[PDB]
Amino acid sequence: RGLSGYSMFAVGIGALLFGYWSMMRWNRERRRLQIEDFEARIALMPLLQAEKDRRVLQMLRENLEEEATIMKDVPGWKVGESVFHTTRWVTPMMGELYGLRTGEEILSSTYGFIWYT
Amino acid sequence: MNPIILIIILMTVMLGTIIVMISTHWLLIWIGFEMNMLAIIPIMMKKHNPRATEASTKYFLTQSTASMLLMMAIIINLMFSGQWTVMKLFNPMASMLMTMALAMKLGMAPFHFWVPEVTQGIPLSSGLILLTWQKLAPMSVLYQILPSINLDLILTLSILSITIGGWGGLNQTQLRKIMAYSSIAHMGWMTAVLLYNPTMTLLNLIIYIIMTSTMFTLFMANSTTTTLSLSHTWNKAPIMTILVLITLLSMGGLPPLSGFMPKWMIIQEMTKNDSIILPTLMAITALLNLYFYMRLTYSTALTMFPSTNNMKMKWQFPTTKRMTLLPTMTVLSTMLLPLTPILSILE
Amino acid sequence: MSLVYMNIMMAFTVSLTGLLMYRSHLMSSLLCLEGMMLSLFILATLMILNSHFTLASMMPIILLVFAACEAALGLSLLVMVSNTYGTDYVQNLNLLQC
Amino acid sequence: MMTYIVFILSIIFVMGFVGFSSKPSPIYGGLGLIVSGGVGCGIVLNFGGSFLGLMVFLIYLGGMMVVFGYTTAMATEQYPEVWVSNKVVLGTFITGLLMEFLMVYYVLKDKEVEIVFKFNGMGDWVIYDTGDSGFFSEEAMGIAALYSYGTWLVIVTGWSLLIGVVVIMEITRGN
Amino acid sequence: MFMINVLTLIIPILLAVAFLTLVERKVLGYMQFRKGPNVVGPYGLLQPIADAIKLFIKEPLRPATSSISMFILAPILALTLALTMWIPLPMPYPLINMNLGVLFMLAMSSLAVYSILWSGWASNSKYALIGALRAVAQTISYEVTLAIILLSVLLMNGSFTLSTLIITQEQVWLIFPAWPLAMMWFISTLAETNRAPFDLTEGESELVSGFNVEYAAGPFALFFMAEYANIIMMNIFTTTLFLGAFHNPYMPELYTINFTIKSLLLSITFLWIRASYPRFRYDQLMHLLWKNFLPLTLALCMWHVSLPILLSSIPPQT
Amino acid sequence: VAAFLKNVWAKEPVLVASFAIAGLAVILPTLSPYTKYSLMINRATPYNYPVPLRDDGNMPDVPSHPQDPQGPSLEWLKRL
Amino acid sequence: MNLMITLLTNFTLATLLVTIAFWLPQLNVYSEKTSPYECGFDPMGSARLPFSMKFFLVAITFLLFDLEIALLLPLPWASQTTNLNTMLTMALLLIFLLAVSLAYEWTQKGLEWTE
Amino acid sequence: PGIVELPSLEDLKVQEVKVSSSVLKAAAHHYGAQCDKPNKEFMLCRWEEKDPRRCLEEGKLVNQCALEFFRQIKRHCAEPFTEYWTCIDYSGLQLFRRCRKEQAQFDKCVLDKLGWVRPDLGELSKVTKVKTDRPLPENPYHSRARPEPNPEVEGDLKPARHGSRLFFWTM
Amino acid sequence: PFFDVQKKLGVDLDHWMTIQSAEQPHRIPARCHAFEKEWIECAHGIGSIRAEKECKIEFEDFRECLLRQKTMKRLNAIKRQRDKLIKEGKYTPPPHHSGQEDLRP
Numbered sequence A: 001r002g003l004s005g006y007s008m009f010a011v012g013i014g015a016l017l018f019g020y021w022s023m024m025r026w027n028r029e030r031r032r033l034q035i036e037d038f039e040a041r042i043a044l045m046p047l048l049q050a051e052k053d054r055r056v057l058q059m060l061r062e063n064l065e066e067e068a069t070i071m072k073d074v075p076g077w078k079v080g081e082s083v084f085h086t087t088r089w090v091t092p093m094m095g096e097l098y099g100l101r102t103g104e105e106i107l108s109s110t111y112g113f114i115w116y117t
Numbered sequence B: 001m002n003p004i005i006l007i008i009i010l011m012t013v014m015l016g017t018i019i020v021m022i023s024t025h026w027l028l029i030w031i032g033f034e035m036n037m038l039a040i041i042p043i044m045m046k047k048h049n050p051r052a053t054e055a056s057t058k059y060f061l062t063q064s065t066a067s068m069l070l071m072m073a074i075i076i077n078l079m080f081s082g083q084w085t086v087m088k089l090f091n092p093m094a095s096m097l098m099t100m101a102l103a104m105k106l107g108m109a110p111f112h113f114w115v116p117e118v119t120q121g122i123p124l125s126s127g128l129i130l131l132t133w134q135k136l137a138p139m140s141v142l143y144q145i146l147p148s149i150n151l152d153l154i155l156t157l158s159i160l161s162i163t164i165g166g167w168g169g170l171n172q173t174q175l176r177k178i179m180a181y182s183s184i185a186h187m188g189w190m191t192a193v194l195l196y197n198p199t200m201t202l203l204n205l206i207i208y209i210i211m212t213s214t215m216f217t218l219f220m221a222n223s224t225t226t227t228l229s230l231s232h233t234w235n236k237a238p239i240m241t242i243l244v245l246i247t248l249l250s251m252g253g254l255p256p257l258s259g260f261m262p263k264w265m266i267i268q269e270m271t272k273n274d275s276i277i278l279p280t281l282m283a284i285t286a287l288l289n290l291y292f293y294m295r296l297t298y299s300t301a302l303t304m305f306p307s308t309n310n311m312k313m314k315w316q317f318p319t320t321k322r323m324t325l326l327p328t329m330t331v332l333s334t335m336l337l338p339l340t341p342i343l344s345i346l347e
Numbered sequence C: 001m002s003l004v005y006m007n008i009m010m011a012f013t014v015s016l017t018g019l020l021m022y023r024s025h026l027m028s029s030l031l032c033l034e035g036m037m038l039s040l041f042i043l044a045t046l047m048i049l050n051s052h053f054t055l056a057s058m059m060p061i062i063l064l065v066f067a068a069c070e071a072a073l074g075l076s077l078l079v080m081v082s083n084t085y086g087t088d089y090v091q092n093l094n095l096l097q098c
Numbered sequence D: 001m002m003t004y005i006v007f008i009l010s011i012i013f014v015m016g017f018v019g020f021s022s023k024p025s026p027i028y029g030g031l032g033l034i035v036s037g038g039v040g041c042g043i044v045l046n047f048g049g050s051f052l053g054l055m056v057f058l059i060y061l062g063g064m065m066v067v068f069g070y071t072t073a074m075a076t077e078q079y080p081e082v083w084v085s086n087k088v089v090l091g092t093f094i095t096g097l098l099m100e101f102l103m104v105y106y107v108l109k110d111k112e113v114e115i116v117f118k119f120n121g122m123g124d125w126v127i128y129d130t131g132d133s134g135f136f137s138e139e140a141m142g143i144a145a146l147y148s149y150g151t152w153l154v155i156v157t158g159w160s161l162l163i164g165v166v167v168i169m170e171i172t173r174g175n
Numbered sequence E: 001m002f003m004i005n006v007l008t009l010i011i012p013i014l015l016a017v018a019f020l021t022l023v024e025r026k027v028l029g030y031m032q033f034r035k036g037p038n039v040v041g042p043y044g045l046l047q048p049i050a051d052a053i054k055l056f057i058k059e060p061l062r063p064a065t066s067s068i069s070m071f072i073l074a075p076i077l078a079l080t081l082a083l084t085m086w087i088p089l090p091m092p093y094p095l096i097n098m099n100l101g102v103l104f105m106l107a108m109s110s111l112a113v114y115s116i117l118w119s120g121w122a123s124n125s126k127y128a129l130i131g132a133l134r135a136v137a138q139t140i141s142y143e144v145t146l147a148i149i150l151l152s153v154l155l156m157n158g159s160f161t162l163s164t165l166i167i168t169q170e171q172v173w174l175i176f177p178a179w180p181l182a183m184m185w186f187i188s189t190l191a192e193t194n195r196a197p198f199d200l201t202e203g204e205s206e207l208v209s210g211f212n213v214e215y216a217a218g219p220f221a222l223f224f225m226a227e228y229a230n231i232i233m234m235n236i237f238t239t240t241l242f243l244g245a246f247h248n249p250y251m252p253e254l255y256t257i258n259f260t261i262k263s264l265l266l267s268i269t270f271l272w273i274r275a276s277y278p279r280f281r282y283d284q285l286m287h288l289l290w291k292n293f294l295p296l297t298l299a300l301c302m303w304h305v306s307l308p309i310l311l312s313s314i315p316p317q318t
Numbered sequence F: 001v002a003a004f005l006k007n008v009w010a011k012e013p014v015l016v017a018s019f020a021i022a023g024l025a026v027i028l029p030t031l032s033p034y035t036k037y038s039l040m041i042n043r044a045t046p047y048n049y050p051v052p053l054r055d056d057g058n059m060p061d062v063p064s065h066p067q068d069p070q071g072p073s074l075e076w077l078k079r080l
Numbered sequence G: 001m002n003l004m005i006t007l008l009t010n011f012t013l014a015t016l017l018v019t020i021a022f023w024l025p026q027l028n029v030y031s032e033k034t035s036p037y038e039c040g041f042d043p044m045g046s047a048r049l050p051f052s053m054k055f056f057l058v059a060i061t062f063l064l065f066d067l068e069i070a071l072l073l074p075l076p077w078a079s080q081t082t083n084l085n086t087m088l089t090m091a092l093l094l095i096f097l098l099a100v101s102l103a104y105e106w107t108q109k110g111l112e113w114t115e
Numbered sequence H: 001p002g003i004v005e006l007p008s009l010e011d012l013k014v015q016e017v018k019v020s021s022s023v024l025k026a027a028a029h030h031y032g033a034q035c036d037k038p039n040k041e042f043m044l045c046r047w048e049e050k051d052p053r054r055c056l057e058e059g060k061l062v063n064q065c066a067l068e069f070f071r072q073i074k075r076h077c078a079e080p081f082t083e084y085w086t087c088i089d090y091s092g093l094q095l096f097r098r099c100r101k102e103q104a105q106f107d108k109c110v111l112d113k114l115g116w117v118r119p120d121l122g123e124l125s126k127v128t129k130v131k132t133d134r135p136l137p138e139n140p141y142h143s144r145a146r147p148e149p150n151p152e153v154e155g156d157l158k159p160a161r162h163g164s165r166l167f168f169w170t171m
Numbered sequence I: 001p002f003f004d005v006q007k008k009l010g011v012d013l014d015h016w017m018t019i020q021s022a023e024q025p026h027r028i029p030a031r032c033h034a035f036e037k038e039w040i041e042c043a044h045g046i047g048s049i050r051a052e053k054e055c056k057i058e059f060e061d062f063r064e065c066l067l068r069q070k071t072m073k074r075l076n077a078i079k080r081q082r083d084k085l086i087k088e089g090k091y092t093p094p095p096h097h098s099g100q101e102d103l104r105p
């Protein structure tokens, strides 16, 4: 009983060709959709970058205006002294921003993306 | 072994040494050492007897431990420098660990405890590969990190290697253990001049490889692995006794021979740097190497030990062996001292 | 430096002294070389993921490859010791002492 | 004490290393190395390397299954040492654990320590980047660059694995 | 409220294992011309409860020669790794949405071997020793193709994310471009999950009960409800790979019903295979996944690398 | 060559299918017109930000707005 | 966070199905029921004797081929590159080197078992 | 070293764009079309200064130009945009492909009432030229004087004086 | 023996993973790209002996970018003094270091 060999190989290769055609069309459509999502990301990035700059400068100024109040009795302390010889901007460390804040904000800001589900 | 597989495995040993020599990245140095070890293990187990398996196990454990210390030195360099360039090391801890790793890979004392064992366990051809070609990749890395090598460490390793390799060969009657303690003493000579003039390190490496390749080619051409079987060579091929005479007197550092060439130049570069005690102790300690070389010349060339009756059959058969470059290496290991200023090509 | 590098270097040294002090059993120390590879993996990978030097992120994979590419070598050299002798005890490998 | 999670996983990493480095038996050596390689893919997974931790987990699971098969076939004795059967196993196991928790105690009380290097005592959350990588995890991009940029590394690694197979079949012959 | 979301995962699949025992026995009965359990409940709907009460009130029988710590730790890790491979599975929304959920499935498949392996070693018995090292021979056989098949089918996905494997199969099933990979993956999951013809560790005709021959009831239950959890998870994983259903984002229950009935048909297919085929020998197992499936898997890996470049159909990674 | 091919298809057909699929995967991307579009799609996928240029005064090919006619276009991807 | 809660739950109610499996039934311990199983007769010798592995060369080569799926695994990400013919050449080079390895292990009878 | 110079808290106060991410992603293409010029002046200042403290004022222009983008949506097309960002906001990955009919209604209402063309596939990823009057930073890395290199080799290569001069070798 | 085949033949075998400032995939910067660029452009061509003392400042800034030892020591001092002032009760934390602050964006 059953079909011959050539008939089953023809049905299998035809199923291959149909799957390859359908995945060709759908992956080209998915690449176009990815480019659309990335251009939405690009168009949002200047506003997010400006808010991120004001965010980190807000946090560094809050860490600086509270460093002078803590560091008042300590002799020879220099408030806001850079640990770098250069005067170039350095991107802040995680401890430079969230070093004086609560552990909930620390965990949600430094392990939040990795631990998220 | 299937000769296609032998060709591929020997080209892979050579490829590991070349990948260490030509690469500017620390991971590729480590890959070259791993490839070198991995490919040279079946060269040691070419014969499949328990001594080759023991030698291969001891060699695998020593070289694997050395490669672990090498990669830890590489990762500490990555921490303290943020980069991977094969140059000086930016931490004395990584400098110490890499100097220990390369000293283990060279078999320099007090990490010398594998070189007579592994050299005795394996054949003379694989022992030649071990004592010559495997002394090229760690000497490359030592040539490349000498702005960061601790002076006290490399000089302690060097003089400890010279003393222990001198005393070790005096108690030996096996030719492979003699060549292994000779290796230890000569690597001490090469690394003692490493921070003063590494051109003399390369000179000593090249002259040593010539003399060691001459001695192993003479041992293979005579099929001798003990002192007392080398002592039958006068009754079979008396020119080979002359060749081992001139080569062993060359390896002892006697003028007017070329093995006096590295030693003298090493002294010539260590007295410039106001070190007088250290090359003097090195020269006096090389008399031990000369003493067991003279023991082998007494047993082989200068006297005639009694032979057997069956040697009369071996008079009727010539050598069909590939004594590859044996007259060339015999001439280069003995008569090269008038060409001593050729060492400037190694600059 | 950072606190985790203390314990990863500590694990390297623990596996180092475990390798470098044999307990007369060769498989128990071939595990220690594999542990040294694990500690080097995690140490290098913490350094590379920390500094965002992304192109060296392929480096620990390569490192890990040569890990088993010698570990398999050791096992291929473990079975020849354990075919000559009934056990893989390292004190049976003392023929080259003479 | 949840900000110290990478430190706590690293304590379990050192505990697994003292577990298999005391060398009880390669059954329990494989146990301890699986435990260390499974918390080590939790140390390094909290730095962003989710691909690069799952692989050191998976490769070492295959590795310890192979090592299990060999230590049941070759490295087997009648009474295997569990963790406490030998005095020299238990002594150095307790020694490694007491010295490890000793340098835990000296680094949480003082917030700095020095064994050969100097180490901080704050939680290692402090050193992370305060930015985002966009629509790519950067370690995946770097390991993806092994095919575009790492061509010589591909050639030497694939050649080393090929001759590793050839080398191993030349060793395990006997004649 | 995530703890409820965990308890609404593992408790309905400690029930689906229980009724899977009944479905296994009854489909095994009606394919062997007899009937299954129809005595305890209404046509057998209480026989799983009867077995689940019987196994946990029987004397546990810890042996005298057994390494007791590994003897107890091995069924705990069995049921632990049986439960924890359900968390990246999209139903259409997974419990824990992993960016690399496929490699989590693969790594926990590699870790779940040690439950069988340490259970066979710990119970110091000669039949449990043979059933332990047959798991080594089985795992060095399927794992060397379990990863390249799963690589080649994700070269049409673009990532290792299981949830993106629904978006991948929104037009056509991924069994149509990858049916050799599908009919090789299905056999690889038979060989993984210790189902017939690849039992080979609990191989009843050779080894009396195999690796768990010393495990009496109670700890025997956690190897018996772990393996069935592995077959339901594994057919859900095969359904997600090759038989991905329609997902409406406003009606998730349509996707849940669709992949549920597809995974039930694949579980019934496992029961069809267990009730009809002679069991391999565990070297002929190895000369199948190495001499037959591994070269063709390497060829299809070359093809599924080169084909999305050949047709400009490289799937997105986002 | 045909009799040996029939012989190996009769004896080891899995290996024949393996070498056939591998040979197609080797030779066929070099014989396809769509392999160019793979590279063109991959280099037109904007992961990074298109960092703008300071207008010196002489850049006729660089636009001043994304909806300007000059610049790289993706109409070939829209049609295909 | 949720991952460790899920793993803690799975481990917790996998070990709490064991502690109510040992402590709930009535124990009757005597030193013949806890003996090992050798089909009724007493076992001759210990099961801690070396059980010789016939598939040992395949087991060592599994260590090498499992590294290949640490090298071939970034191919869904390597296909996203902008140097793509080079990626395709290196990918086909890695699968071809794995295949040359498997062919060498075949023809030298490394896949067969001993005895 | 020196005191780090941070701006004060009053220097950072600006009327923020207090909308969610789906509201931003729904209006993203028209934001990249209409708010092109101060955004590109800001990102040019941001990659050239390499210092956010020298980029605040341009950044405020961004926060000036985004809000006027949304008020002009709020005055005219508040309800089709509200339905469109709600439908975007439902999805987990926030798919544009699940919301094409609300996108068509929003684009039609915007093109009728405000005359904005939505950017096509490929336009927002272009590298554009920006006409600014701020100076080019002459040292954005705050670097210093590079050390003087070693002098090169020059002159014709004469032979060695008396050969090698190695103890007695006259050549 | 640094037989520099890669510069003789002009091939790039491993110069690309050499430093962090090299060409990275998708233009991803390292966290110490500016520090390493300044150190390499300082120490280029002047040799190692002049580079160990004339480019010491850029290499100290770059090493302190890499390991952040001075930063973590300063944060140790700040956090320890803050904990001491909390323990003595001579200082209270502000509301924006406790949560109730209605954060920026």
Ligand SMILES: CCCCCCCCCCCCCCCCCC(=O)OC[C@H](COP(=O)([O-])OC[C@H](O)COP(=O)([O-])OC[C@H](COC(=O)CCCCCCCCCCCCCCCCC)OC(=O)CCCCCCCCCCCCCCCCC)OC(=O)CCCCCCCCCCCCCCCCC
Pocket: B256, B337, B338, B339, H168, H169, H170, H171
């Ligand atoms: C129209 C166009 C064409 C016109 C063509 C016109 C010419 C036609 C002939 C061309 C061919 C060349 C012929 C020789 C030229 C002159 C070379 C010469 O005598 O230099 C004197 C040379 C320096 O003397 P000088 O008073 O300062 O200057 C006279 C010249 O103006 C020196 O002039 P220079 O300043 O230019 O010399 C440079 C430098 C000047 O020398 C120096 O800077 C002093 C340091 C030289 C090396 C010292 C090394 C000491 C430690 C090793 C000692 C080894 C053992 C000693 C020998 C044992 C026997 C093997 O020499 C070297 O660096 C080369 C090293 C010595 C090789 C000399 C040439 C030998 C060729 C034949 C080889 C036969 C075996 C020779 C012995 C083997 C050992 C060399 O004397 C020595 O070094 C003492 C040894 C004697 C030299 C070799 C004698 C050659 C004739 C041998 C015939 C009998 C052979 C018997 C069988 C073989 C022995 C068993």
Ligand SMILES: CCCCCCCCCCCCCCCCCC(=O)OC[C@H](COP(=O)([O-])OCC[N+](C)(C)C)OC(=O)CCCCCCCCCCCCCCCCC
Pocket: A009, A012, E180, E182, E183, E184, E185, E186, E187, E197, E238, E242, E273, E277, E288, E291, E292, E293, E296, F011, F012, F014, F016, F017, F020, F021
């Ligand atoms: C995922 C959803 C389900 C998918 C389908 C699965 C459902 C069906 C399952 C049926 C029950 C199976 C129970 C277990 C059986 C185990 C035994 C078994 O299967 O052994 C495998 C058998 C083994 O056969 P064997 O063992 O007889 O092999 C003999 C080998 N020698 C000679 C060395 C002894 O077959 C295979 O290995 C084939 C695997 C699949 C092949 C797919 C080929 C696709 C087409 C290739 C190209 C062909 C054309 C040429 C090129 C053209 C190019 C244009």
Ligand SMILES: CCCCCCCCCCCCCCCCCC(=O)OC[C@H](COP(=O)(O)OCCN)OC(=O)CCCCCCCCCCCCCCCCC
Pocket: B123, B125, B126, B128, B129, B132, B133, B136, B202, B205, B206, B209, B210, B213, B217, B220, B321, B322, B324, B325, B329, I001
């Ligand atoms: C600073 C870096 C410098 C780098 C310089 C590189 C130069 C070339 C490489 C030199 C390094 C050492 C070379 C020798 C390695 C050992 C080769 C070997 O063992 O070959 C095997 C073969 C065995 O001979 P057979 O009798 O057939 O064997 C029976 C069964 N085994 O044959 C033998 O064992 C016989 C010996 C063959 C090789 C000896 C000749 C080459 C080395 C001697 C110096 C030649 C002069 C030119 C180079 C100078 C620098 C070394």
Ligand SMILES: CCCCCCCCCCCCCCCCCC(=O)OC[C@H](COP(=O)(O)OCCN)OC(=O)CCCCCCCCCCCCCCCCC
Pocket: A113, A114, A115, A116, A117, D034, D035, D038, D039, D041, D042, D043, D045, D046, D050, D051, E073, E080, E096, E097, E098, E099, E100, E101, E104, G001, G003, G004, G007, G011
């Ligand atoms: C004595 C014998 C042993 C007895 C005790 C046995 C205990 C149970 C053993 C089995 C469980 C082993 C777990 C191993 C680690 C698994 C890590 C994991 O699940 O990673 C998957 C996932 C990756 O997702 P990702 O791509 O990061 O996406 C998030 C980014 N947006 O990751 C995520 O989504 C990130 C979520 C947070 C991850 C935290 C770090 C991992 C925690 C490891 C816990 C300890 C593991 C111990 C292993 C022991 C092995 C025997």
Ligand SMILES: CCCCCCCCCCCCCCCCCC(=O)OC[C@H](COP(=O)(O)OCCN)OC(=O)CCCCCCCCCCCCCCCCC
Pocket: E294, E295, E296, E298, E299, F008, F012, F015, F016, F017, F018, F019, F020, F022, F023, F026, G096, G099, G100, G102, G103, G106, G107
């Ligand atoms: C060039 C394209 C890329 C090729 C390389 C990539 C391959 C990818 C697939 C992975 C393959 C890995 C394993 C390959 C092993 C081959 C060697 C082998 O197994 O030889 C033995 C076999 C006969 O088996 P036997 O000797 O009986 O073994 C004992 C068990 N019965 O011997 C045989 O079966 C005969 C083998 C030689 C003849 C095969 C002919 C196939 C022709 C297919 C059509 C043409 C395809 C284009 C390529 C040219 C082929 C000549």
